[PDB]
Amino acid sequence: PCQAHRTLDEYWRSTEYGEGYACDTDLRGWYRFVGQGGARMAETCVPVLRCNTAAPMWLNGTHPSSDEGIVSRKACAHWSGHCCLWDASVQVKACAGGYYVYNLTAPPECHLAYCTDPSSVEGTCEECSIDEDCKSNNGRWHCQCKQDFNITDISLLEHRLECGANDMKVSLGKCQLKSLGFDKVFMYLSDSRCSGFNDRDNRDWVSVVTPARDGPCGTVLTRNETHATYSNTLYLADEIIIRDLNIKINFACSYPLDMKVSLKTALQPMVS
């Protein structure tokens, strides 16, 4: 199936080619279309006199998504003005990655051959981050994160506050908030102008960065005799308005006042 296939590097199978006479009677086995013609074979009945054939072919319905296996389809033939006048047997199996396979059978008679539309070679799956499986839904490749990444309660929500000296920031896992029930999040400080954004260090993260001064985005410094802590409240809602489960992550971190300091150069004098 996905490993036992024969490639077809033919650019004349495309729907744009003018006209031809080649009919596939010797084609047998799993096939993987490769080249400028396209990676998937036609979904609609392409008009007459195309695909280097007097009567071109197409597959009816939709392409299988990822994790579907062997699927039974009946590749129709367009000719004389009636779409799907002749039929051939085709079995599509989705594969892990950006290609598809077929048992391309001999049509009932010559003057019949398959086609290859430009398909979705533009649609790439590398855009999915490393933990996002290259899953598909009805032929489109999406970045579904780990199903093991499934947390129900928000008390288990992940957050990494790194209390940098010059600036404060809290980073949140995008996959965990996705599975928590959030499609698009709206993270906000005590001032909403401190809106959230996305960053990737080891995974998909959404983060905010705030200067560690008293006032600029409403963070509060309460310096007790020892520490100087900065607390700002984090606001989460997966849309403009919250109607239930109002979220308030009260983040803070303190900076000391005392610290040890020394050079990085040795020192030796010389004397009589």
Partner 1 sequence: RNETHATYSNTLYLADEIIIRDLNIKINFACSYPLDMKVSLKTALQPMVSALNIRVGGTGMFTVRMALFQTPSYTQPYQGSSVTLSTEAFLYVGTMLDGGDLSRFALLMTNCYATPSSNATDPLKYFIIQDRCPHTRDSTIQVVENGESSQGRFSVQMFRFAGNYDLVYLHCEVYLCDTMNEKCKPTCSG
Ligand X SMILES: *[C@@H]1O[C@H](CO)[C@@H](O)[C@H](O)[C@H]1NC(C)=O
Ligand Y SMILES: *[C@@H]1O[C@H](CO)[C@@H](O[C@@H]2O[C@H](CO)[C@@H](O)[C@H](O)[C@H]2NC(C)=O)[C@H](O)[C@H]1NC(C)=O
Ligand Z SMILES: *[C@@H]1O[C@H](CO)[C@@H](O[C@@H]2O[C@H](CO)[C@@H](O[C@@H]3O[C@H](CO)[C@@H](O)[C@H](O[C@H]4O[C@H](CO)[C@@H](O)[C@H](O)[C@@H]4O)[C@@H]3O)[C@H](O)[C@H]2NC(C)=O)[C@H](O)[C@H]1NC(C)=O
Would you tell me which residues interact with partner 1 (CB under 8 A)? Answer: 154-155, 157, 159, 161-168, 170, 186, 188, 190-192, 211-214, 218, 221, 223, 228, 230, 235-237, 239-271
Phi-psi region of 122 (alpha: psi -120 to 50; beta: other; left: phi over 0): alpha
Cα separation, 93 vs 1, whole angstroms:
7
Minimum distance, C-beta of residue 40 to partner 1, in the bound complex (Å): 30
**184, 174 contact by CB (below 8 A):** no
Residues 209 and 214: their CA atoms lie apart, in Å, by: 15
Nearer to ligand Y, 23 or 177 (CB): 23
Q: In angstroms, rounded to a whole number, what is the distance separating the alpha carbons of residues 88 and 29?
A: 14
Q: Specify whether the CB–CB gap between 49 and 138 falls below 8 A.
A: no
Tell which one of 65, 91, 129, 254 touches ligand Z (CB under 6 A). Answer: 254
Chain-centre distance of CA 243, in angstroms?
Answer: 29
* Residues in touch with ligand X (CB under 6 A): 60-61, 74, 84, 87
CA distance 15 to 36: 11
C-beta of 180: minimal distance to partner 1 in Å?
A: 12
Indicate the residue among 88 and 212 with the shorter CB distance to ligand X. Answer: 88
Cβ within 8 Å of residue 98, ≥6 positions away: 39, 121, 123, 124, 125, 141
Q: Which is nearer to partner 1, 8 or 253 (CB)?
A: 253
CB 167 within 8 A of CB 209: yes
CB of 84 to ligand X, least distance (A): 5
- Judged by CB under 6 A, the residue of 16, 195, 227, 245 near ligand Z is 227
What residue is closest to ligand Y based on CB? 103
Q: Does residue 162 bind ligand Z (CB under 6 A)?
A: no
Q: Nearer to ligand Y by C-beta: 193 or 260?
A: 260
Amino acid at site 24: D
Binding at 215: pick from ligand Z, ligand Y, partner 1, none (beta carbon under 5-8 Å per type): none
Partner whose binding site includes residue 160, from ligand Y, ligand Z, ligand X, none (CB under 5 to 8 Å by kind):
none
Q: Determine, following the binding rule CB under 6 A, whether residue 229 of this chain makes contact with ligand Z.
A: yes
